[PDB]
Design an enzyme around this catalytic site. Sequence first.
Site, short mmCIF file in Angstrom:
data_model
loop_
_atom_site.label_atom_id
_atom_site.label_comp_id
_atom_site.label_asym_id
_atom_site.label_seq_id
_atom_site.Cartn_x
_atom_site.Cartn_y
_atom_site.Cartn_z
N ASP A 180 -111.59 -31.33 26.44
CA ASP A 180 -111.97 -30.13 27.21
C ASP A 180 -112.06 -30.42 28.70
OD1 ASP A 180 -112.09 -28.44 24.98
OD2 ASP A 180 -114.13 -27.84 25.19
N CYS A 214 -99.41 -25.43 28.31
CA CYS A 214 -100.82 -25.48 27.94
C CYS A 214 -101.30 -24.08 28.29
CB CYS A 214 -101.60 -26.65 28.55
SG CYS A 214 -101.38 -26.93 30.31
N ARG A 220 -101.21 -30.39 32.08
CA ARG A 220 -100.86 -31.26 30.97
C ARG A 220 -99.36 -31.22 30.69
NH1 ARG A 220 -105.69 -29.05 26.85
NH2 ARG A 220 -107.34 -29.19 28.44
N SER A 221 -98.76 -30.04 30.81
CA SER A 221 -97.33 -29.88 30.70
C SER A 221 -96.58 -30.71 31.76
CB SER A 221 -96.95 -28.41 30.81
OG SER A 221 -97.56 -27.64 29.77
N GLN A 261 -102.48 -31.08 38.03
CA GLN A 261 -103.48 -30.21 38.62
C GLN A 261 -104.64 -30.95 39.27
OE1 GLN A 261 -104.53 -26.14 36.71
NE2 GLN A 261 -103.95 -27.45 34.97
#
Length: 280
Positions: A180, A214, A220-221, A261
């Site tokens: 998370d 995502c 994450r991608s 990010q």
Amino acid sequence: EMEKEFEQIDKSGSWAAIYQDIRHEASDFPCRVAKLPKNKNRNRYRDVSPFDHSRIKLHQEDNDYINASLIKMEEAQRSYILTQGPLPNTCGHFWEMVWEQKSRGVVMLNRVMEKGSLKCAQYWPQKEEKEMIFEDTNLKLTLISEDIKSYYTVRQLELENLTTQETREILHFHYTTWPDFGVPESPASFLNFLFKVRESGSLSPEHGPVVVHCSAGIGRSGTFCLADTCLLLMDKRKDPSSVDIKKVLLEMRKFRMGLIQTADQLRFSYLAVIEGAKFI
Ligand SMILES: [Mg+2]
């Protein structure tokens, strides 16, 4: 070695500064179609839009818009479509894109709920006997099989174009253990997951581009595609030590904004490429 670069950034505590410089160098292209008022409900996040030049177009006269970008990596000879997690009203569009782009694989890097909020729609069927029909794009989607492992689940899905009755098998590779908050402590299971996607043929040039998402389709991608490409380039080049992850990332950022990010995602991507290089 990027490992020596990595250790240097670690010791000097400069991840934030290295990352901010990437942010500053990154391409800035217009996202005019994304920002049209009629497409407001097709975007999850106001600050995550596909550039016009690289956006995926739906094949329809009404509204061709989906929040998705083609990242085309010339030297690596890999292409990826990065997209947001489908919204309640864009699941039909999502599967239309998969169909029209001739994708074999969908890579999902989030859980449907994280941090107690919905990060995307439940866009695939959870039971064999309860198929989904997307009436707006005239597609049927059926769970064919599901293999749940500790760090990921792989599903076989059948996608039918109801207009022509053609069917295709799509592989759904769902990484289920990204925390998370933050990034994984070790890249081992993420790398294993990447290798499983590779092994399936979903990244290969005989298929359309893999669809990766995502919630927003950049963090994450980005990590997944940056790692894959870097490792491919180390295998392909005469001088593997010439592969510069910052340069690859900047190149990928020409096609979609905001890939990677946080500084922690950057550090993690380095870690994945370094460990993955040692395995190979
Ligand atoms: Mg059952």
